[PDB]
Each structure stands twice: as C-alpha cells, then as structure tokens.
Design an enzyme around this catalytic site. Structure first.
Site, PDB file in Angstrom:
ATOM      1  N   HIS A  20     -15.819   1.795  -3.927  1.00 21.74           N
ATOM      2  CA  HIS A  20     -15.874   2.925  -4.894  1.00 21.74           C
ATOM      3  C   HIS A  20     -17.182   3.285  -5.552  1.00 21.74           C
ATOM      4  O   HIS A  20     -17.222   4.303  -6.248  1.00 21.74           O
ATOM      5  CB  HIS A  20     -14.867   2.729  -6.013  1.00 21.74           C
ATOM      6  N   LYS A  73      -7.992   4.574   5.949  1.00 15.67           N
ATOM      7  CA  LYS A  73      -7.538   4.691   4.567  1.00 15.67           C
ATOM      8  C   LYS A  73      -7.396   6.191   4.311  1.00 15.67           C
ATOM      9  O   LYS A  73      -8.344   6.940   4.541  1.00 15.67           O
ATOM     10  CB  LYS A  73      -8.515   4.046   3.575  1.00 15.67           C
ATOM     11  N   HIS A 122      -9.840  -1.788  -9.742  1.00 11.86           N
ATOM     12  CA  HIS A 122      -8.979  -0.849  -9.022  1.00 11.86           C
ATOM     13  C   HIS A 122      -9.302   0.533  -9.571  1.00 11.86           C
ATOM     14  O   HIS A 122      -9.516   0.674 -10.779  1.00 11.86           O
ATOM     15  CB  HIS A 122      -7.511  -1.186  -9.339  1.00 11.86           C
ATOM     16  N   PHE A 123      -9.343   1.521  -8.693  1.00 12.25           N
ATOM     17  CA  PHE A 123      -9.551   2.899  -9.143  1.00 12.25           C
ATOM     18  C   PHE A 123      -8.182   3.572  -9.203  1.00 12.25           C
ATOM     19  O   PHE A 123      -7.506   3.682  -8.176  1.00 12.25           O
ATOM     20  CB  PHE A 123     -10.455   3.604  -8.174  1.00 12.25           C
ATOM     21  N   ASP A 124      -7.759   4.003 -10.388  1.00 13.20           N
ATOM     22  CA  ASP A 124      -6.387   4.504 -10.537  1.00 13.20           C
ATOM     23  C   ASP A 124      -6.232   6.005 -10.319  1.00 13.20           C
ATOM     24  O   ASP A 124      -5.317   6.453  -9.601  1.00 13.20           O
ATOM     25  CB  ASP A 124      -5.810   4.133 -11.886  1.00 13.20           C
TER      26      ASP A 124
HETATM   27  N1  LIG Z   1      -3.284  -2.097 -13.318  1.00 14.38           N
HETATM   28  C1  LIG Z   1      -3.819  -2.763 -12.273  1.00 14.38           C
HETATM   29  N2  LIG Z   1      -4.614  -3.885 -12.393  1.00 14.38           N
HETATM   30  C2  LIG Z   1      -5.113  -4.546 -11.333  1.00 14.38           C
HETATM   31  N3  LIG Z   1      -4.883  -4.155 -10.064  1.00 14.38           N
HETATM   32  C3  LIG Z   1      -4.098  -3.058  -9.825  1.00 14.38           C
HETATM   33  C4  LIG Z   1      -3.530  -2.281 -10.938  1.00 14.38           C
HETATM   34  N4  LIG Z   1      -2.827  -1.249 -10.422  1.00 14.38           N
HETATM   35  C5  LIG Z   1      -2.942  -1.363  -9.088  1.00 14.38           C
HETATM   36  N5  LIG Z   1      -3.687  -2.435  -8.734  1.00 14.38           N
HETATM   37  C6  LIG Z   1      -4.010  -2.819  -7.328  1.00 14.38           C
HETATM   38  O1  LIG Z   1      -4.346  -1.666  -6.557  1.00 14.38           O
HETATM   39  C7  LIG Z   1      -3.978  -1.855  -5.190  1.00 14.38           C
HETATM   40  C8  LIG Z   1      -3.269  -0.634  -4.627  1.00 14.38           C
HETATM   41  O2  LIG Z   1      -4.220   0.133  -3.897  1.00 14.38           O
HETATM   42  P1  LIG Z   1      -4.501  -0.105  -2.321  1.00 14.38           P
HETATM   43  O3  LIG Z   1      -4.222  -1.549  -1.970  1.00 14.38           O
HETATM   44  O4  LIG Z   1      -3.773   0.970  -1.558  1.00 14.38           O
HETATM   45  O5  LIG Z   1      -6.095   0.191  -2.239  1.00 14.38           O
HETATM   46  P2  LIG Z   1      -7.233  -0.945  -2.411  1.00 14.38           P
HETATM   47  O6  LIG Z   1      -7.833  -1.130  -1.045  1.00 14.38           O
HETATM   48  O7  LIG Z   1      -6.630  -2.139  -3.123  1.00 14.38           O
HETATM   49  O8  LIG Z   1      -8.359  -0.292  -3.390  1.00 14.38           O
HETATM   50  P3  LIG Z   1      -7.999   0.306  -4.838  1.00 14.38           P
HETATM   51  O9  LIG Z   1      -7.266  -0.856  -5.470  1.00 14.38           O
HETATM   52  O10 LIG Z   1      -9.217   0.623  -5.659  1.00 14.38           O
HETATM   53  O11 LIG Z   1      -7.151   1.522  -4.543  1.00 14.38           O
HETATM   54  C9  LIG Z   1      -3.083  -3.076  -5.143  1.00 14.38           C
HETATM   55  O12 LIG Z   1      -3.856  -4.117  -4.542  1.00 14.38           O
HETATM   56  C10 LIG Z   1      -2.793  -3.395  -6.598  1.00 14.38           C
HETATM   57  O13 LIG Z   1      -2.612  -4.803  -6.824  1.00 14.38           O
END
Ligand SMILES: Nc1ncnc2c1ncn2[C@@H]1O[C@H](COP(=O)(O)OP(=O)(O)OP(=O)(O)O)[C@@H](O)[C@H]1O
Length: 124
Positions: free
Chosen positions: A12, A41, A119-121
């Site tokens: 990110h 992705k 994590h990017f929300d």
């Molecule tokens: N409030 C939070 N605190 C910490 N981690 C979080 C939170 N909300 C979601 N996550 C993490 O975000 C992820 C969901 O996104 P995903 O796995 O699709 O993309 P990523 O490769 O993990 O990158 P990003 O997390 O930045 O989207 C999960 O691994 C989840 O555990």
C-alpha cells in the site's frame, strides 16, 4: 515471515510518486509488489504520502472498521491515492488494471507496539 506492518508497506505505500504516474501505473505496480503472484488481486489502493504521515493516522480519528473491530482510524487530511481495479481483459497470469487517481481521506487498521498500520480498510 513478512511482518503485518511490512506487508502493509509492500501492498500500500508508494511514496516515490506524488500521484498516478500514468495509465500503465497499476499494471506495473501490482506486478512488482507481488500482488498478482497467486491470483489477480481484484482491488488495491496505493498511498502517495510519506511513511511517517501514514503511520500518524493511527493517532487520528477513531472509526469503526468494516469487520466490526474498533482499531480503525480515518486521516483528518486528504491524501493522494491510486486505486487499482481489475479489468475485463484481465486473465491470470496476465492481470490487467485500470488506474484511478484520487485525493481522499484514508481509513487504516492499526495494531502492535509500536502501533502501526496493518490493513487498508477504505477511502472516503
Ligand atoms: N480491524 C482490523 N485489524 C487488523 N486486521 C484486519 C482488520 N480488518 C481486516 N483485517 C485484515 O484484512 C485482511 C482482509 O484483506 P485481504 O486478506 O483480502 O487483503 P490483504 O492482502 O490482507 O491486504 P489488506 O489487509 O491491506 O487488504 C484480513 O487478513 C484481515 O485479518
């Protein structure tokens, strides 16, 4: 193992450019950051601000996370971001992306000591 903080920087952070470089930006960046290795992705956001400015968001406006946790923070200022979104022509391993530049507030989840983005929300 890659730490969650390091993973956030890889996925990110792009401080090297101030905005979306060109129409090709997302195709190049999604590849080079290892985000197309196991699949395309489907969506990803890059932030064009210094690491210090993005880490500072962990002491800014506390907001509910999309998953219901309370460890999300919204930046008070807008930030320069690039959204990458997978196209129709995109077929793995030939992943293809549309590049959109915007200036928006970002929302990140933070964890740890030190307390840093993991994590990017969302962007708003
Ligand atoms: N409030 C939070 N605190 C910490 N981690 C979080 C939170 N909300 C979601 N996550 C993490 O975000 C992820 C969901 O996104 P995903 O796995 O699709 O993309 P990523 O490769 O993990 O990158 P990003 O997390 O930045 O989207 C999960 O691994 C989840 O555990």
């Amino acid at each position: 193992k890659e730490t969650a903080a390091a993973k956030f920087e890889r996925q990110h952070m792009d401080s090297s450019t101030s905005a979306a470089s060109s129409s090709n930006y997302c195709n190049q960046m999604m590849k080079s950051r290892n985000l197309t290795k196991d699949r395309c992705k489907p969506v990803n956001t890059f932030v064009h601000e210094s690491l210090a400015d993005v880490q500072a968001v962990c002491s800014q406006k506390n907001v509910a996370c999309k998953n219901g946790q309370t460890n999300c923070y919204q930046s008070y200022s807008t930030m320069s971001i690039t959204d990458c979104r997978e196209t129709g022509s995109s077929k793995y391993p030939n992943c293809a992306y549309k590049t959109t530049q915007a200036n928006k507030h970002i929302i990140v989840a933070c964890e740890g000591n030190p307390y840093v983005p993991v994590h990017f929300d969302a962007s708003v």
